[PDB]
Nucleic acid binder design. Structure first.
Ligand SMILES: [Mg+2]
Ligand SMILES: [Mg+2]
Ligand SMILES: [Mg+2]
Ligand SMILES: [Mg+2]
Ligand SMILES: [Mg+2]
Length: 1185
RNA sequence: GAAUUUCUACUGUUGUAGAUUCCUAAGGCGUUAC
DNA sequence: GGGGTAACGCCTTAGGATAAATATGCTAG
DNA sequence: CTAGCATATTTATCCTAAGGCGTTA
C-alpha cells in the first residue's frame, strides 16, 4: 500500500488558486456604499474594456504600418522552397535543423522589421496612454470625445494595464509560440502559400480545362515573390479576395470539379491563408403585440375582398384541379418525400418513378419539376405494390385539396402553449404550400409561361405568410436564451496595484493585510488615503484581545532580485563589488548558457552574493543556511536555495480595539475570508481547499514550507441574479430524493432557500497558493516509475478502465499473475453513505433534457452532471490505486479511439482522463496524518504535470495508455479473435474462400459443428495457430433495422439448428460423421451461399447484444483445450462476469504486457510502451505458459 | 420544488460526501438554421 | 452527401501568480 | 527657486530537459 508510492512525494511544485467569500465585518459595507466604490469599479471595468479595444485598434494600425516596409532577403525564400518540397526523404538533420534555421532567419527578419518602427519604443509603457494614444485619436478621422475621455480616465492608472501589455508583448516575438505574428506568418500562411503556388502551377501546366483559364493586379500574373506583399493584413485580404470567392481564381475550379466529380481534381482546390493576428425582442409585451398584429393581418375581418390567407389559400389549392397542370411547378426537395409519404404511404414512389420512367446520364437534375410530368410519371410507376388499377385521377390535386380542407377542418383558430400551437400550425401550412412557391429567379432555366389566374394570386398570397420565418428567427432569438449569472466585477478599492503582493515592505503600496482571530481569517484592505495605518502600532500587549497580522517576507525571483539589488546604481557603492566581480558579471562567464563559462568564476560570484546577502539588512533576517559553495554545479542551485529559504511568515499581535477603531473610522475595509467549513456549525471533514488554506499558516508547515502564499490575488463582486426565491418553509417536512434513504421526511427549524448564494450580492476572493514549494526538479517522473517497476514485479496490481455501452464506466483490478482480483461497474458509486445510482439519474436527465427542449423551458445541464459524476470516479480510482498497489491503464484517445454507441463519449472520456491526471498530481487524503506518505504535507505525486492531450505519451507516471484495438471481442481464455470478413456478392470468390478451410465436419457428440482452419491462409500476415471454431456460441441474431417487422430486434436462434435447416434443403449429409468440406462445392443458388455466409457471421463473433434488457455476454465459439467454452453467464469470479467487463479486463492485460515489457528491457528512458496488434495477439494466445 | 468559493449527489440539520487553478489575451475547429 | 452566413458550443496556445529601484507629482521655499 | 516625502512605473533576467509512429474500434 504505502511502500510502493512512498518515494513519489515532493516531486514537482504546483500552483493552484483557492477561492473564498469575503463577508464584510462591522461598518465595512456601510463605508464602501458611502464612498460608492462598487459603482465606480463597474464604470472602471467598462472603461477598461473600451480602452482595451482602443489599444487593440492602435496595435492593428501599428502592425499594418510596420509590415508594409518589410523586404525579405529572398535568398532564404528559395532555400525554404527547396527544403520544404524535396520529398519526404528521411527524418535526418538536414530535414529538421536546416528547416528550423531558415524559419528562425525569417522570423528574425520579421521581428527586425517590427522593432525598427519608432512607436515600438513606447508601445508597452506609460508614454503610450499618456501621449501616443491621444495623438492617434486626434489624427483619427472619426474618433470622438468619448474615446478621448475614456483614454484620459486612465491617465494615472497605467500600471493597471501591465497584464494587458505583457499579453500584447507575445505578438511581437520571434519564439515558437502560437501567439506570435512572425510565427504565424512563417508556419501557417507561408506553407499554405507554397502549397497553393505549386498546385496552381501544376493545374495550369497539366492541360487546359473546361472552364476559362483566367487569362482574360492579379496573383496569377504576379505569383513569384508575392508573399512579401502578403505579410500585411491588407495584402492577405486582397490575396484571399482574388483567390477565394465575386469571381475568384479558384471559384472557376470549384465550379468545374463538380462537373468532373474526380478526387484528383477536388484536392487542387486552393486552401486559404490564415488571418493575421489581431485583424478584423425587448420583453413579453412586444412579443404579444407582434403576435396580435400577425393575427390581425392573417384573419382580419373579411373586409375589402377576402384577405384571409387561411381560407383563400385553401380555396386556391382546391381549385388546382380546374387549373391546368401543364404550367404548375413542384419542388424537388423533401416536399416530394412528404407528398409521397402522404399519398401512398411510401416516401420513395414519386422519386423512383421520376428516376426510372421520366428519364434515365445525370438525369438533367432541375430544381423544380412539373405537375403534369409528375402525374404522367405516377400514372405508370411499374406498380411495385398496389391494386391492378388505381383510381388516382388527379392524385396531386386531390392530395392538395385534401390536405387543404379535409385534413382536420380546424385550420381557423400570453401563454406560450396557445402561441406555440398557433405558430406550429402556421409553419405546417407554410411548409405544405412551400413546394408550390417559386424561390428566387432563373433557377437552372425552365420558368416558362405559368398559369396567370393561379400563380398571380398565389405569389401575392404567399408573401404575407412568408413573414413567419423572420418572426420565427426573432422568437427563437428572444424567448430562447441558466437562472443565475456568474458575472463578477473586479474591485480595486482605488488602488491599481491592489493585492499584487503580501510583503511587509509593499503593504503600504498594495494596501492589503491578512489578520486572524480565534481561528477565523480576515482580509484588511486599507483606504488608499490611509494606507499607512499598519506602521504605527502602539503596542502588542496580550492582556486584551488581539488580532494576528501576518508578517509576510519573500524574495520572489533570485536570478532577478539578486543582481537588481546588489548591482543597482544606488547600492553598488554599499556592497562594493570588486572590479573582478563586475567583469565576471558583464562578460557572462557565470552563465552556463554563455560560451565563456568558468566554474571558479561562478563560485566567486556566488561567494560575493552570499557576502552581500549577509550584508543586507532585510535579507539577513531570512536565516539563510547555505550549503558549501563548492557543491554548486552552477548558479542555478544557488538561486534555487535562495528562493526556497527566502520565504517567512510570522504573526504579530495587534490590539482588537485598534482594528475596530480603524474599521469604524472608515480607514480599513475588514472582510472575513469565509467558507462553509469556517462556520461554527460545521462538524464533518472540510474541503481540500479549506485544509490547504489552514495549512498555509500551520506551524508544522511553517517549520519547513510546503504551501506558499502567492501574491497577485483578486477580489471580485457578484450581484444578485435571482430576485424571486423558492423557499422550503420552516417546520414543514420535505420529501427525500434518494430512493435508498431510510428516512423519507425531513423537518427543519429554519428556511432552506434554493440557490441562496445567488439571491444576494456576494464578494469574492481568489487566492493563489503553491503546493510543494521546495520540490526541486522532477516534472517527468517516468524515469523513476519505470526504474521502480523493474524491481518489484510480484507486488504491483493493474487497473483497467473502459467506457462501456451498458455501464458508464467499468474497472477491473487484476494481479500480476493475470487472474482478476476485484471488478465492479462504476455506473454506481458506494461511499460510506447512501449510494448514487449515477446510471439511473443520468438517463432521467437525458429524458428530461429532450422533453424540455421539445415543448419549452430548456435548462440543459447534463454536461455538468456527467462532469460531476467523473469527479467521484476519479476519487474512487485514486483510493483504489493507493490501497491496492496498482498502476492505472486506460484507453488511449489519440491513436486508436473506439467506436460510438457508448454512454461516455470520446470528449467526456478525455476530460475524465484530464481530471484523473490533475487529481494524481497532488493526492492528499482527508483522513491521513499530515506527516505520513499521502497526508496533507506528504502528498502523493503519481503523475507528471499536465501539459496537453498530445504532450502525454504512452505513460503519464503511474498511468499507462494503450490502444483500444481488439479489447472487447476476445476470450479471457485462449484468445480467439474475429479476424474474418466474408465479403459476399462475389460468387466466384466464395468457393475459393471456403476452399482454404482445413476441415468442415459434423460432431454428433457435443451437438455442435466444427470449423477447422489456420490463420495463415486467410489474414495473410502470418501469426497465431490453428483454430477450432465451433458453433456453440453467438446465438443472437438481428433480423433487420428499418421500419416495422424489420426493425432492430433480437431473436434467440440456435446456430446448429439453422445449420441443419440450411443443409437439409440441399441434401448435404452430415450424420455420417465425415467431413462435408467436399460437399459445398456444388455452385448455383447464390441465395444459399448468402444465407450460409450470413449464418457464418452469426457463429464466430462473441459479443451478443440486445436493445432491451441487460442481456449481454461474450460466449465464445472456440475450445479452451479443456472441454468447455467460455460463457459470460457462468462467471467464475475470476473472468469478466458481464459482457462489458471484458474490455476492462483486456485493458488490464495490455497493462500487464506493458509491465512485462518494462521488466525485460534494460534500456530505460527509451522504453517502447507501444503495443502493436501482432505482439498483442501473440501475448493473448499464451497457450503453453 | 434542497443551504455550497464553485460543481455534482444530497438532508447527512444554518449543513453532509467527493472533485475544485484563477484572471487576461490570441487563434483554430464544429452540429446548426439560416 | 449540399452554392459565398455567425449567434452558440468545443479545442489549441501564451502571460502572470513580485519586491525593489527609479522617475515623477506635490509640499516647501 | 528647491530637500524631502509619497506615489506610480519600469526593472531585474538561471537552467534544466525534451518528445514520436504500432491503423484501425
Ligand atoms: Mg500603487
Ligand atoms: Mg464536507
Ligand atoms: Mg471499450
Ligand atoms: Mg460546500
Ligand atoms: Mg444542486
Amino acid at each position: 500500500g504505502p511502500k510502493m508510492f512512498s518515494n513519489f512525494t515532493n516531486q514537482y511544485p504546483l500552483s493552484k488558486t483557492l477561492r473564498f467569500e469575503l463577508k464584510p465585518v462591522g461598518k465595512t459595507l456601510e463605508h464602501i456604499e458611502k464612498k460608492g466604490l462598487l459603482e465606480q469599479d463597474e464604470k472602471r471595468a467598462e472603461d477598461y474594456k473600451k480602452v482595451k479595444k482602443i489599444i487593440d485598434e492602435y496595435h492593428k494600425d501599428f502592425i499594418e504600418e510596420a509590415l508594409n516596409n518589410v523586404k525579405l532577403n529572398g535568398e532564404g525564400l528559395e532555400e525554404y522552397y527547396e527544403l520544404y518540397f524535396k520529398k519526404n526523404k528521411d527524418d535526418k538533420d538536414k530535414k529538421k535543423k536546416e528547416f528550423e534555421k531558415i524559419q528562425d532567419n525569417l522570423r528574425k527578419q520579421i521581428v527586425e522589421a517590427f522593432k525598427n518602427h519608432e512607436k515600438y519604443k513606447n508601445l508597452f509603457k506609460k508614454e503610450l496612454i499618456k501621449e501616443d494614444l491621444p495623438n492617434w485619436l486626434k489624427n483619427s478621422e472619426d474618433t470622438g470625445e468619448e474615446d478621448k475621455e475614456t483614454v484620459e480616465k486612465f491617465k494615472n492608472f497605467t500600471t493597471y494595464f501591465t497584464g494587458f501589455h505583457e499579453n500584447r508583448k507575445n505578438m511581437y516575438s520571434d519564439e515558437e509560440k502560437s501567439t506570435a505574428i512572425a510565427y504565424r506568418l512563417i508556419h501557417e500562411n507561408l506553407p499554405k502559400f507554397l502549397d497553393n503556388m505549386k498546385v496552381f502551377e501544376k493545374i495550369k501546366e497539366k492541360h487546359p480545362e473546361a472552364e476559362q483559364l483566367e487569362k482574360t493586379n492579379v496573383e496569377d500574373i504576379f505569383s513569384l515573390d508575392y508573399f512579401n506583399h502578403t505579410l500585411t493584413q491588407s495584402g492577405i485580404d486582397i490575396y484571399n479576395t482574388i483567390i477565394g470567392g465575386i469571381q475568384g481564381l479558384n471559384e472557376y475550379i470549384n465550379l468545374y470539379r463538380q462537373k468532373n466529380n474526380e478526387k484528383n481534381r477536388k484536392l487542387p482546390k486552393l486552401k486559404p491563408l490564415y488571418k493575421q493576428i489581431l485583424s478584423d425582442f425587448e420583453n413579453d409585451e412586444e412579443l404579444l403585440e407582434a403576435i396580435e398584429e400577425f393575427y390581425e393581418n392573417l384573419n382580419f375581418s373579411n373586409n375589402n375582398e377576402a384577405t384571409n390567407v387561411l381560407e383563400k389559400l385553401k380555396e386556391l389549392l382546391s381549385n388546382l384541379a380546374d387549373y391546368d397542370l401543364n404550367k404548375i411547378y413542384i419542388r424537388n426537395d423533401t416536399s416530394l418525400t412528404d407528398i409521397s409519404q402522404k399519398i401512398f404511404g411510401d416516401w420513395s414512389v414519386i422519386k423512383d418513378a421520376l428516376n426510372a420512367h421520366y428519364d434515365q446520364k445525370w438525369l438533367k437534375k432541375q430544381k423544380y419539376f412539373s405537375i403534369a410530368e409528375l402525374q404522367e410519371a405516377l400514372d405508370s410507376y411499374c406498380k411495385e405494390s398496389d391494386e391492378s388499377k388505381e383510381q388516382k385521377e388527379n392524385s396531386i390535386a386531390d392530395y392538395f385539396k385534401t390536405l387543404a380542407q379535409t385534413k382536420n377542418e380546424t385550420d381557423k383558430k400570453k401563454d406560450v402553449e396557445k402561441i406555440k400551437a398557433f405558430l406550429d400550425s402556421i409553419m405546417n401550412l407554410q411548409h405544405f404550400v412551400k413546394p408550390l412557391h417559386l424561390v428566387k429567379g432563373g433557377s437552372a432555366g425552365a420558368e416558362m409561361e405559368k398559369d396567370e389566374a393561379f400563380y398571380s394570386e398565389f405569389e401575392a398570397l404567399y408573401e404575407e405568410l412568408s413573414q413567419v420565418i423572420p418572426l420565427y428567427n426573432k422568437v427563437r432569438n428572444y424567448l430562447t436564451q441558466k437562472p443565475y449569472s456568474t458575472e463578477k466585477i473586479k474591485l480595486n478599492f482605488e488602488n491599481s496595484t491592489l493585492l499584487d503582493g503580501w510583503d511587509v515592505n509593499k503593504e503600504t503600496d498594495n494596501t492589503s493585510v491578512l489578520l486572524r482571530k480565534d481561528g477565523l481569517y480576515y482580509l484588511g484592505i486599507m483606504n488608499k488615503k490611509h494606507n499607512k495605518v499598519f506602521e504605527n502600532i502602539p503596542e502588542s500587549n496580550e492582556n486584551d484581545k488581539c488580532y494576528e497580522k501576518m508578517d509576510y517576507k519573500l524574495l520572489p525571483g533570485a536570478n532577478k532580485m539578486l543582481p537588481k539589488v546588489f548591482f543597482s546604481n544606488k547600492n553598488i557603492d554599499y556592497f562594493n563589488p570588486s572590479a573582478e566581480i563586475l567583469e565576471i558579471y558583464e562578460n557572462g562567464t557565470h552563465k552556463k548558457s554563455g560560451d565563456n563559462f568558468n566554474l571558479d568564476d561562478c563560485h566567486k560570484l556566488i561567494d560575493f552574493f552570499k557576502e552581500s546577502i549577509n550584508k543586507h539588512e532585510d535579507w539577513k533576517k531570512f536565516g539563510f543556511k547555505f550549503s558549501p559553495t563548492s557543491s554548486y554545479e552552477d548558479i542555478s542551485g544557488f538561486y534555487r536555495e535562495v528562493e526556497q529559504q527566502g520565504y517567512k511568515i510570522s504573526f504579530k499581535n495587534i490590539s482588537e480595539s485598534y482594528i475596530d477603531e480603524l474599521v469604524d473610522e472608515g480607514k480599513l475595509y475588514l472582510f472575513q475570508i469565509y467558507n462553509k467549513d469556517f462556520s461554527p456549525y460545521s462538524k464533518g471533514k472540510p474541503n481540500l481547499h479549506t485544509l490547504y488554506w489552514k495549512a498555509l499558516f500551520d506551524e508544522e508547515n511553517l517549520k519547513d514550507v510546503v504551501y506558499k502564499l502567492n501574491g497577485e490575488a483578486e477580489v471580485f463582486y457578484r450581484k444578485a441574479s435571482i430576485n424571486e426565491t423558492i423557499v422550503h418553509k420552516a417546520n414543514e417536512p420535505i420529501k427525500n430524493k434518494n430512493p435508498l434513504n431510510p428516512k423519507k421526511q425531513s423537518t427543519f427549524e429554519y428556511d432552506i432557500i434554493k440557490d441562496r448564494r445567488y439571491t444576494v450580492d456576494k464578494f469574492q476572493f481568489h487566492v493563489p497558493i503553491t503546493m510543494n514549494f521546495k520540490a526541486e526538479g522532477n516534472s517527468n517522473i517516468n524515469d523513476e516509475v519505470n526504474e521502480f517497476l523493474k524491481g518489484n514485479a510480484p507486488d504491483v496490481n493493474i487497473i483497467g478502465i473502459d467506457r462501456g455501452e451498458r455501464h458508464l464506466l467499468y474497472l477491473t483490478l487484476i494481479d500480476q499473475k493475470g487472474k482478476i482480483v476485484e471488478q465492479d461497474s462504476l455506473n454506481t458509486i458506494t461511499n460510506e453513505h447512501n449510494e448514487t445510482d449515477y446510471h439511473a439519474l443520468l438517463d432521467d436527465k437525458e429524458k428530461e433534457r429532450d422533453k424540455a427542449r421539445k415543448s419549452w423551458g430548456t435548462i440543459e445541464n447534463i454536461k455538468e452532471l456527467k462532469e460531476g459524476y467523473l469527479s467521484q470516479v476519479v476519487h474512487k480510482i485514486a483510493k483504489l490505486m493507493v490501497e491496492h498497489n496498482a498502476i492505472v491503464v486506460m484507453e488511449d484517445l489519440n491513436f486508436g479511439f473506439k467506436r460510438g454507441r457508448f454512454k461516455v463519449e470520446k470528449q467526456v472520456y478525455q476530460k475524465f482522463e484530464k481530471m484523473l491526471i490533475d487529481k494524481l498530481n497532488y493526492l492528499v487524503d482527508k483522513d491521513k496524518e499530515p506527516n505520513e506518505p499521502g497526508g496533507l504535507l506528504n502528498a502523493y505525486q503519481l503523475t507528471n504535470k499536465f501539459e496537453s492531450f498530445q504532450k502525454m505519451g504512452k505513460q503519464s507516471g503511474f498511468l499507462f495508455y494503450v490502444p483500444a484495438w481488439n479489447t472487447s471481442k476476445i476470450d479471457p481464455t485462449t484468445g480467439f479473435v474475429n479476424l474474418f470478413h466474408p465479403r459476399y456478392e462475389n460468387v466466384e470468390k466464395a468457393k475459393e474462400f471456403f476452399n482454404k478451410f482445413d476441415s468442415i465436419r459434423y460432431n454428433s457428440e457435443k451437438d455442435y459443428f466444427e470449423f477447422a482452419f489456420d490463420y495463415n491462409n486467410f489474414t495473410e500476415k502470418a501469426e497465431g495457430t490453428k483454430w477450432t471454431v465451433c458453433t456453440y456460441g453467438e446465438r443472437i441474431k438481428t433480423y433487420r433495422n428499418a421500419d416495422k417487422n424489420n426493425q432492430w430486434d433480437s431473436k434467440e436462434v440456435n446456430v446448429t439448428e439453422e445449420f441443419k435447416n440450411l443443409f437439409d434443403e440441399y441434401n448435404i449429409d452430415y450424420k455420417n460423421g465425415n467431413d462435408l468440406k467436399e460437399a459445398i462445392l456444388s455452385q448455383d443458388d447464390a441465395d444459399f451461399f448468402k444465407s450460409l455466409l450470413h449464418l457464418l457471421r452469426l457463429t464466430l463473433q462473441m459479443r451478443n447484444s440486445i436493445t432491451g434488457t441487460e442481456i449481454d455476454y461474450i460466449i465464445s465459439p472456440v475450445a479452451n483445450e479443456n472441454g468447455e467454452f467460455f460463457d459470460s453467464r457462468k462467471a467464475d469470479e475470476s473472468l469478466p462476469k458481464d459482457a462489458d467487463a471484458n474490455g476492462a479486463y483486456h485493458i488490464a492485460r495490455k497493462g500487464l504486457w506493458v509491465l512485462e515489457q518494462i521488466k525485460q528491457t534494460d534500456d530505460l528512458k527509451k522504453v517502447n510502451l507501444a503495443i502493436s496488434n501482432k505482439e498483442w495477439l501473440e501475448f493473448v494466445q499464451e497457450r503453453k505458459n
